[PDB]
Symmetry: none
């Protein structure tokens, strides 16, 4: 994959019985781990809920993989990969996502499907009281030939509280495991941020930085990473 | 709704990155709570996973509502209703469903969308080692003007074990709450059974009985139901 | 075990950093599945939380086992048994219990240890706005030589809503599994009720009825129980 | 609190009906965030399960708090603090902890109570197949005037696999709110390691390093921490 | 009045049937128009609504009166004054205030009574979605021998929108009319800001600056102020 | 509630900076909708304003509810209810009320708080030129689980003129919404009259009749009430 | 005026910048207070908002004037009259109307001008979610030689909720007040209903019944109307 | 838009049943915010009421927009814009306006429609006892993709009084959302003055200055505008 790529996104979903569609165009630097997307709600907008719950569904090939840790995603090209995830919110809401990622030339194409349910009508998401995500730390490890990820995230609320959730992901390379260098357990920091909202809450400029690493602040007494 | 109805079902989903579609034809006695469907996997079959996980997604308007408990579903007609649910398996798999139910004459039409993820490849579902569901007891109660349901189910496994899961559902009538007689807290027994599999594992004859009731084995010292 | 037995209970626990102890004396009809206990909060009372969360922790040897289903608990005497459980509330609270049951003469003696955490201070439990439990249906199945149980329960709230939780239990007979007739998958209905509260909310008269059974509302078309 | 302190620990617990007690003596540098403890299983040892599940229960006053982030724990002395936690394992096990932390002289004294249940008998924990924890990243945020923490951890298994769990903690200062400066949302890295096992599997030399910080790998484009 | 003063405040109110009391200690520079208050919700806190609605009720003797405009408030000492006001929110809520202001030595003492009603439960105030007030411009004019004020204010919401309201005030000097120089029509800019929230949302550090003036951005073609 | 009840009232308020208190003893026939109160101004009398503005603040449990329309107020006992209201006068005055209603045996107890402001000094109220209220028609409808009311009223002046006002009320039952039969849109006619004034304008014998009904003069062509 | 008349109406207006024109043909029985009009949107239809807001603008000479109450409108012929009104909706919308009424032979001719503004785009009116008006009660009283009217009305919504508004009207006879018998304070019930919609939502069959009266449900102790 | 423009205005209205028309020729400097118009009452003049109520209806494209605040009005050219407003007077009068603004070359063309009602006959407006407007401060904020404005104004009265009113405006650009940069919350000062009246009270020379800005007199302690 190139050091500079374009991004094209297509999303379709139903949350609490509300159908919607989104499309986005963006750019990013795969090896630097930085990127940005201009996401437009093409159908069903303005959404009856905070766009925040859609943010993390909109790019793991773009991450600075450090410490010699094998990059499961960049290794997957040209074949590409898909990933699936369920996000469990502390107030009972569930959001499941199926995504396909393809690399056509220097353009990353994302096709996303989402199904969300049980979001409380008077909760922060449905009441649009949330104000973006705190950065997070994803735990990555292999299992049964695929790469798994788990993360705890926190939505900022106007009152100062946070609404937390748990992401459980399975990343699936289109390359056979035999053709891949599987990575050891490691982490990936992510910082998604919406820097601008326009067109009556239907257009969002979203930026994100990601870095894969080992625990660097606490030294091992046993020579482990 | 009449005493005898026809059932037409359309389903589309992706589980562990495997896309599939199903269509069914059936019948049922709404007030007797008995029904049967002939479900055909029209695309993506035979499925690489046990059809058992799709079974509970294929009819709550057909239930013998006893003890004078108001029937939230039959009351929603002719407008109909929709429901959303996430099923959490004990081995980490999640399956989210979005469904729409409408009544055309004396025919119930179901449109279903499913997204499933994280099913362990060596688990009983992906290995097709499950052998049907044990009967179950659903807990139903109102909240925020809609009807909620929660159930623990158990899939019989060939090794003698049971694989358990937790269903969390929100049923949404298309009629305004004020035009409905909301039910008190109650239960609903369900007994889905596959009696025949044919056409190279793509046609499933599925029967089911459902009965809404109160606890009927434990007396109350306070006269409560 | 006899047709009528006495009950002596000792409980110690800490919930949200509040330490407390309870003692109770009661009676029951093991085969009839009916019982009553006069539970006194001996230390740390009045509790800063609803007594309702302790109710389900205060007697499975007392249950009417029907349909020829082997009784794992009564079979365990005179040796007795222990059980361990964690209850997960929908608003983030957890309550773990460890219990020992023995039969001394004609008296069932219960020794209970409880640790609870993360109960929301503005929640119905910590605000004492709950009004007893709704009857429930426990799912029972064997696994690895022991008997397991899972149940969803709902706490009635003052505002009319229900607070739901999930119980995950493991019952351990003190007799070697070898000397026991392990039961098939089955259910158990429970109806715990507090009929009187006195001594400034430190004494509770609690009654309960339990019945072990199979699904008796939905006939099986495959000849299964 | 002194920059050099000793540690004294007392633990009692029951896991899968196995009762045990532990005691430890150690030392640490509160502001450097480094520490070591010699933990002896004084009763019920050698344990019938991996000591790994006990490891994370044995010291948050010892953490290097960087970036001027208010230190909830060090601000709590001399009054001290307590914390409560439930750890949920992916294979159904639950472990709940209640802890009290006091400073006697220049020695941190820990009193721990543990209740564990539903650990699978043939699982890696009960089979003693785990090989310590991977380092972890805890999410810390305020709620209801106290400090909350949530973490995802992973046990290393022989197969090269990992067994994951989720920690949900509430830290409770015994100091007046008026005398405490609460921290903003932040993280704390922890790396607990058993560097030596002796005395026939009953003595564990455990080291740990902890660092509280903001996300430093991913720059904010909104000027946030 | 001194160039520097202390502030002491006592408030009692009921909003949407929720009773509360507040007390505050602060300081200000009467002639510079700047001040600060540390407001504690002594009873009924944390409030079930945004503290923002209470902010503007908490100091008109502290304002920089420019352009030779007579200062109705400072002229009122030592007698002091009272003021009454009703704030009408665009979504149907009303909040009425009665206030007494006295000068005790170097301390301005405020006694406030508040009654609020009809705030929508899912509105920004009851949902705590607001994030402070935008600065505002008060219109001041004499009528029936007293000073009247009217102002349009706007609360900032998490979503980027604003919730507006209308303040209608009557200021009543306790000084004999014959001893007061009544001011001509003029404006007063106000900028209340909460710079810190602590003690579980019950302690607010609030600052404010106020300036009385004529319209200086648009010249008069008739020589009027 | 009984067919014949006693009434005890306690009132405290401040209008245009004039503090006052009232107390009353009365009787009524709840189902007949008739009642009387002997209201005494216990502090601040004679009032510097017409007692007419206090009249409508002095009993909604007493109303003849016709046509099978559910009675929100009588249904609220024994718990009782509260109500809040703001009355907006055409000449700029505002009067806000908070009231609590309890039933003790057959005695209705009212506790009222009032804050009024901006009444013009030369208007009919402050000049005590009003001569009672014309009967009025209240509009009642539910919203967000509570009962709302709105009414336009008119004070009579000797010259044949009227001074109008707008009442905006929220009635809040102390019973759970689930335990109440909510009424459809309807009206309530009210006719308050002061039949005797004594003790130098500090004791008022006030009578009132109230009837809840649908529109009975204009038949519906669509079969609506 | 005769007991059976024809009705002809011409209307032009702009609401939220949408221009439209309407024309109607109908009939009414002046003394019976009943009438019906076939209202056609001749320009700008189908309207981008609910026709419901236009309904009350389409006949006060048609009202059953009971109880000997002087009929300001009937007395105005042959000269006729005009009326002006502003309707204030609770969600911030305003609609102002200017109307002229003349009698040509036995045909009442109405010429209407309307300007509406600030209707929320997502409100029930602009979204066409309203379902007609509930009947209402107008307060009528004289002032400065003319007749005034004020009414609160409520639009019905599907949820069972209502959108309320306030009408403030001034009726102006073309006859000199000297030649008219002015009425005392009284009421007028109105019940507008759309019984048929056709021609792609541009033709509305609307009927209405009106009755002028005094309060007839609450007898007066003092002897007032 | 040019730095120097001409103005052409056409107005038609009906206030308290009095029909009138006006036309004007003017000029202004859009970026400097200064302008003048020579307004002639072409029909229905001299008006039976104060021309002051028409003054604010006669130019928002002419305003000095400072501090980098996006200019909604100038951005709207060449397409143009419209605006709608209702002005509510404290003595019960309402005046609604609909306006269209076009830029033909360097000439701004205004087409204005007005409907006013309920002005008291003995009030200052109808008696022509007003002496021009005091300058004012408009609050501007976006909502639903359009620009809203609200302002309180004060008309100079006879005996040294002021008659106040509230303006509620919606400004509608003819450009699409994608082609506009929406402004943050801000203010606009306005100072309309009649400097000459001639031709028997039918020709008015009116000047005005407007400035859009943030609050500059009161510093923010949080770095907000």
């Amino acid at each position: 994959i190139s050091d500079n790529v374009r991004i094209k996104l297509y999303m379709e979903g139903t949350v609490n019985n509300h159908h919607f569609m989104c499309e986005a165009e963006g750019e990013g630097k795969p090896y630097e781990g930085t990127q940005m997307e201009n996401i437009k709600v093409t159908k069903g907008g303005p959404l009856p809920f905070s766009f925040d719950i859609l943010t993390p569904n909109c790019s793991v090939a773009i991450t600075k993989y450090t410490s010699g840790i094998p990059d499961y995603f960049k290794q997957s090209f040209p074949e590409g990969f898909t990933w699936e995830r369920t996000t469990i919110y502390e107030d009972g809401a569930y959001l499941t996502t199926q995504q396909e990622t393809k690399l056509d030339g220097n353009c990353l194409v994302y096709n996303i499907k989402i199904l969300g349910c049980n979001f409380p009508p008077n909760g922060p998401v449905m009441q649009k009281k949330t104000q973006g995500w705190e950065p997070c730390c994803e735990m990555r490890y292999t299992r049964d030939g695929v790469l798994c990820g788990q993360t705890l995230m926190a939505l900022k609320c106007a009152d100062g509280n946070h609404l937390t959730c748990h992401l459980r992901t399975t990343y699936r390379s289109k390359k056979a495991a035999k053709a891949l260098q599987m990575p050891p357990f490691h982490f990936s920091d992510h910082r998604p941020e919406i820097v601008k909202v326009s067109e009556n809450g239907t257009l969002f400029e979203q930026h994100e930085s990601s870095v894969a690493r080992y625990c660097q602040t606490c030294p091992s007494k046993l020579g482990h990473n």
